[PDB]
Ligand binder design. Structure first.
Ligand SMILES: CC(=O)N[C@H]1[C@H]([C@H](O)[C@H](O)COC(C)=O)O[C@@](O[C@H](CO)[C@@H](O)[C@@H]2O[C@@](O)(C(=O)O)C[C@H](O)[C@H]2NC(C)=O)(C(=O)O)C[C@@H]1O
Ligand SMILES: *[C@@H]1O[C@H](CO)[C@@H](O[C@@H]2O[C@H](CO)[C@@H](O)[C@H](O)[C@H]2NC(C)=O)[C@H](O)[C@H]1NC(C)=O
Ligand SMILES: *[C@@H]1O[C@H](CO)[C@@H](O)[C@H](O)[C@H]1NC(C)=O
Ligand SMILES: *[C@@H]1O[C@H](CO)[C@@H](O)[C@H](O)[C@H]1NC(C)=O
Ligand SMILES: *[C@@H]1O[C@H](CO)[C@@H](O)[C@H](O)[C@H]1NC(C)=O
Ligand SMILES: *[C@@H]1O[C@H](CO)[C@@H](O)[C@H](O)[C@H]1NC(C)=O
Ligand SMILES: *[C@@H]1O[C@H](CO)[C@@H](O)[C@H](O)[C@H]1NC(C)=O
Ligand SMILES: *[C@@H]1O[C@H](CO)[C@@H](O)[C@H](O)[C@H]1NC(C)=O
Lengths: 323, 238, 150, 111, 55, 55
């Protein structure tokens, strides 16, 4: 009712005979958003588990055990995810804010809201990233504090010690350098937060997926400007300088070109969300075989000799850190 | 014996349940009767199979009205068109009309390709489930059943397989003061492979990881350790 | 870049312009069977701007982070455990009239216990009963074998 | 022309091709003595409401009688419910796009 | 009133035939054309002005 | 188009119950052309005089 024809009643009459097709497209959008929300709740209750934490929790008083720092990843909003939210500004919160700047004023180059003014609206997800990041923080501090629901009731240093038992390493040299290996994890954590300043592969894929989304949106933007064999591309000039009966072939050729463009786009979106479902399910698998309980399946959680892993919230995904 | 040895791996001792086999047998048949009466309520699985049959029924229903859409053509019934116009005046709309029909057909088989690919992957996931935790029991948690999954059994379903699962979840708890891992006067560590350690009546006893039962300490319920860490509990004597 | 107009000047007074395109279209609405009224949501738009567009609504305005929600009192004190009318970003509305209550799906039980090694020991709320429960699940493995005569 | 003295929906009487566009409607004066009888009896109650292009809903029962009708133009509950093929829709968050501002007064393209 | 009504072109003379029920035939019911099977049934919901039933 | 809604005027003359209401004219120019429309009731029966006569 807005994209293929904006506001023209004679145009909407010719939309009304074939509005069943775009209503079917809208139903396709409704079900792919239904699978999107369903997979979001799947993410929510697979990160959730049988967790109990002590209600007398203070993140600022008691925050470290045996000299390993977590204040980057300690939230409730952690600094570790907020660094990545500083690295990319195109969050859904940023999308909502960008909708809020586009109500009058400056920045005449405002592509996000003229996408919305042309019709396409990036809906926010039904779960805020604040509560998701708080859930991941709660799971991490469950893994770090008694009772260790995410660490099978085992202290974190004891998890490291019992894992390095099973990887061909004895305990004779281990019992005198707990502080040394603790500083080794601290230096590894400092290295992996410092690596984000350089353009990593994770940065490469997050800006790749958001630029792919923006490129698909811009492909929809130029589809309004495509002729599809017509003498023009929008409805006002062909309603003006033509008499709507010689322009009727122009109108129906442009709307069937646009409808085929939407068919290609919804095929692309269903393929994309199938990829999202597969990647999401693989993420569920690696979450519950690394962070909740390690599994004897070699060379999948981490390349080389895997020891342990941690999961942090990410924009439009999860950030997985493996040691 | 299979389910008794199976819940032993979840951290349950066997001495209590040797006297309690009858009531957990009643728990088995009561769980089966509950899930059998669970289909009387409109649960998720009935909603899932109804969603599947209504989804592809609505897909094949939406296939019908593609014949009945207006398109650019003056009608949708070709019979009255050919009884209304000549053969030469048929092709001015009927060729692109049947072209629209064929675009609907190849679009429809593209969603058919997508749904057959995802249900093939669902069949692969069901295959993984039935060869990892139906014909056997694999060390992989939160994959077949949430929480402490015991075992699973598969029943036949229309256009699918019904996956019913045995899970363990207690109803009451008890607070206790325990310590994970300790060491002895000979500087040899004592740490549970499963469970915790309770100190009462001036002796250090052993408990399971799923039920409060003070067991006598032994050498078979424990993993050995050469030297304990300085931040571990020191137990005098033997 | 993609042929998109920006602004013009007048040939009389030689002053320029920025043509921001206007807004059209509504947002959404919410309905319940046992309710009779409607819950209206107008996201990404100011409540005062909405009231200055046409007229003043019968229900009072309620501006949120999402936008302008109508006919629903915002109540962030309580949390809905399970909702079915999702407003986005963990937000929902329900009928008892229509009011707005923030949504969270899950929570942690928050066991009233300690956090540190009291005397080198820990306070863990271990189970004392033995209880099992069956679990119902379905996986679709087959589809009906449709065909069509071309 | 449609009338139904019996039964609250109205039914077909006859069609009448004229071609001439119909423009005005008027009610005749009835030269009568006293239908009110010093305002103690009945009176005349012709009531009128114009018609135009609208799309409605026609619900049929098992006997083919018009059960209910939906405007789909006045309220927001007028839409959604009628587009979901029911007198009462299910719960859900249904979008609306039935408003355009159109406040313009000048449209020209010139050199 | 395309293929429906009362004014029939009798340029090609065709005799009016009874409804041959329960057979797959083509029909010309007062100019309404098509091909199908007729089964003799009973209905009571029909009206004076109403003569056709639609799905 | 227009919609009308007429309550019946059941005036009861003694042993002769009547229900008579007013008369409406619709048309374009209301002359001896353009097919003027006059419908009137006469005590239980309607009289349509839909002809292009003088007004
Ligand atoms: C539309 C309207 O306002 N109708 C009036 C109607 C007219 O004013 C009037 O009758 C028509 O004549 C003109 C143009 O003056 O009058 C009603 O009241 C009458 C007052 O004139 C009423 O007294 C009638 O008076 C008569 O004397 C008469 O013939 O005029 C006798 C007649 O029985 C009587 N009608 C009664 C009592 O109903 C009217 O005719 O009812 C009031 C209308 O509202
Ligand atoms: C045993 O571990 C605890 C917890 O780490 C130690 O207590 C504090 O630990 C932090 C971080 O390691 C130190 O900054 C504090 O100085 C520690 N406090 C005290 C009083 O020591 C504790 O020290 C450890 N004990 C031994 C013997 O190693
Ligand atoms: C939106 O953009 C305008 C114009 O640049 C700016 O004044 C305003 O502060 C922005 N909004 C926020 C929340 O920063
Ligand atoms: C300004 O406008 C006038 C006419 O209004 C025009 O003649 C002139 O060239 C313009 N520019 C300048 C720099 O004066
Ligand atoms: C609505 O009313 C019906 C009828 O009393 C009742 O059964 C139902 O529980 C009510 N609530 C909902 C959410 O349907
Ligand atoms: C409800 O919304 C109003 C403004 O829309 C705000 O001032 C108020 O604090 C909100 N109530 C809460 C958050 O409880
Ligand atoms: C455990 O729960 C069951 C549930 O009915 C109860 O009958 C029983 O008394 C409880 N306690 C023990 C020790 O089994
Ligand atoms: C019309 O033609 C038919 C023959 O098909 C003939 O029987 C009939 O009398 C004709 N009608 C006239 C001449 O009015």
């Amino acid at each position: 009712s807005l994209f293929v024809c904006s506001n023209y009643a004679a145009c909407h009459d010719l939309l009304s005979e074939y509005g069943t097709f775009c209503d079917n497209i809208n139903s396709i959008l409704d079900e792919v958003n239904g699978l999107l929300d369903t997979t979001q709740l799947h993410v929510a209750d697979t990160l959730m588990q049988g967790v109990t934490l002590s209600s007398n929790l203070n993140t600022n008083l008691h925050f470290d055990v045996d000299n390993i720092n977590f204040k980057s990843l300690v939230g409730c909003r952690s600094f570790f995810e907020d660094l990545l939210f500083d690295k990319v500004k195109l969050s859904d919160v940023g999308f909502v804010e960008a909708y809020n700047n586009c109500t009058g004023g400056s920045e005449i180059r405002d592509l996000l809201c003229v996408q919305s003014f042309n019709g396409i609206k990036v809906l926010p997800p039904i779960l805020s990233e604040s509560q998701i990041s708080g859930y991941t923080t709660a799971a991490t501090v469950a893994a770090m504090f008694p009772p260790w629901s995410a660490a099978a009731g085992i202290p974190f240093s004891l998890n490291v010690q019992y894992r390095i038992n099973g990887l061909g390493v004895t305990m004779d040299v281990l019992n005198k350098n707990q502080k040394l290996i603790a500083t080794a994890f601290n230096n590894a954590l400092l290295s992996i937060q410092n690596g984000f300043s350089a353009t990593n592969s994770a940065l490469a894929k997050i800006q790749s997926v958001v630029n792919s989304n923006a490129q698909a949106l811009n492909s929809l933007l130029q589809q309004l400007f495509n002729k599809f064999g017509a003498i023009s591309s929008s409805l006002q000039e062909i309603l003006s300088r033509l008499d709507a009966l010689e322009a009727q072939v122009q109108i129906d050729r442009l709307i069937n070109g646009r409808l085929t463009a939407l068919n290609a786009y919804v095929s692309q979106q269903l393929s994309d969300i199938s990829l999202v479902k597969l990647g999401a399910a693989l993420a569920m698998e690696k979450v519950n075989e690394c962070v909740k309980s390690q599994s004897p399946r070699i060379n999948f959680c981490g390349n080389g000799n895997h020891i342990l892993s941690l999961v942090q919230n990410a924009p439009y995904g999860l950030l997985f850190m493996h040691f | 014996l299979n389910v008794q040895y199976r819940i032993n791996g979840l951290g349950v001792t066997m001495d209590v349940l040797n006297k309690n086999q009858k009531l957990i047998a009643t728990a088995f048949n009561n769980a089966l009767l509950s899930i059998q009466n669970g289909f009387s309520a409109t649960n998720s699985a009935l909603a899932k199979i109804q969603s599947v049959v209504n989804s592809n029924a609505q897909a094949l229903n939406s296939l019908l009205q593609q014949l009945f859409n207006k398109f650019g053509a003056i009608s949708s019934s070709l019979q009255e068109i050919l009884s209304r116009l000549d053969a030469l005046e048929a092709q001015v709309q009927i060729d692109r009309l049947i072209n629209g029909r064929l675009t609907a057909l190849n679009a429809y088989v593209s969603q058919q390709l997508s749904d057959i690919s995802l249900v093939k992957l669902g069949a692969a996931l069901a295959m993984e489930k039935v060869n990892e935790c139906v014909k056997s029991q694999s060390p992989r948690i939160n994959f077949c059943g949430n929480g402490n999954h015991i075992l699973s059994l598969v029943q036949n379903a229309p256009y699918g397989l019904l996956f019913m699962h045995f899970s363990y979840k207690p109803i009451s708890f008890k607070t206790v003061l325990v310590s994970p891992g300790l060491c002895i006067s000979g500087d040899v560590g004592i740490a549970p492979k499963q469970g915790y350690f309770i100190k009462h009546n001036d002796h250090w006893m052993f408990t399971g990881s799923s039920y409060y039962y003070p067991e006598p300490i032994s050498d078979k319920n424990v993993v050995f350790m050469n030297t304990c860490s300085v931040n571990f509990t020191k137990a005098p004597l033997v | 870049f993609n042929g998109n107009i920006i602004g013009f000047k007048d040939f009389v007074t030689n002053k320029t312009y920025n043509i921001f395109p206007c807004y059209a279209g509504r947002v959404s609405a919410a309905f319940h069977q046992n309710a009779s009224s409607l819950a209206l949501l107008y996201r990404n738009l100011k409540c005062s701007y909405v009231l200055n567009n046409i007229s003043l609504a019968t229900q009072p305005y309620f501006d949120s982070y999402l936008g302008c929600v109508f006919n629903a009192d915002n109540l962030t004190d309580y949390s809905v455990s399970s909702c079915a009318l999702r407003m986005g970003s963990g937000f929902c509305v329900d009928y008892n009239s229509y009011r707005f209550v923030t949504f969270e799906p899950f929570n942690v039980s928050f066991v009233n216990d300690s956090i540190e090694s009291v005397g080198g020991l820990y306070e863990i709320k271990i189970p004392t009963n033995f209880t099992i429960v069956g679990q119902e699940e379905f996986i679709q493995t087959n589809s009906p074998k449709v065909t069509i005569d071309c | 022309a449609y009338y139904a003295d019996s039964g609250m929906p109205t039914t077909f009487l006859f069609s009448l091709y004229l071609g001439t566009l119909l423009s005005h409607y008027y009610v005749l004066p009835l030269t009568c003595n006293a239908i009110s009888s010093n305002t103690d009896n009945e009176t005349l109650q012709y009531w009128v409401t114009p018609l135009s292009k609208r799309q409605y809903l026609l619900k049929f029962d098992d006997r083919g009688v018009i059960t209910n009708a939906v405007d789909c133009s006045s309220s927001f509950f007028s839409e959604i419910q009628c587009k979901t093929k029911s007198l009462l829709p299910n719960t859900g968050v249904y979008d609306l796009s039935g408003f355009t501002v159109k406040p313009v007064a000048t449209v020209h393209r010139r050199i | 009133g395309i293929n429906s009504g009362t004014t029939c072109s009798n340029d090609l003379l065709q005799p009016n035939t009874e409804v041959f029920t329960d057979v797959c035939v083509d029909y010309d019911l007062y100019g309404i054309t098509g091909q199908g099977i007729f089964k003799e049934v009973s209905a009571v919901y029909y009206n004076s002005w109403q003569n056709l039933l639609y799905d | 188009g227009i919609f009308s809604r007429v309550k019946n005027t059941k005036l009861y003359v003694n042993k002769t119950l009547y229900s008579e209401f007013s008369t409406i004219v619709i048309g374009s120019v209301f002359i001896n052309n353009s097919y003027t429309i006059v419908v009137q009731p006469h005590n239980g029966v309607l009289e349509i005089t839909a002809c292009q006569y003088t007004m």
